[PDB]
Amino acid sequence: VYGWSSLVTSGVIEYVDGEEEETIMIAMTPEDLQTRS
Taking CB under 8 A as the rule, does residue 33 contact other proteins?
A: no
Give start and end residues of each alpha helix (H) in 1-37.
4-9, 18-21
Report the candidate in 22, 4, 23 with the shortest Cα–Cα distance to residue 14.
4
Nearer to other proteins, 21 or 31 (CB): 21
Q: Binding pattern to other proteins, positions 3-32, x when CB under 8 A?
A: --------------------xxx-------
Task: Count interface residues toward other proteins (CB under 8 A).
Answer: 3
Alpha carbons 12 and 36: distance in angstroms, whole number: 25
Contacting residues toward other proteins, per CB under 8 A: 23-25
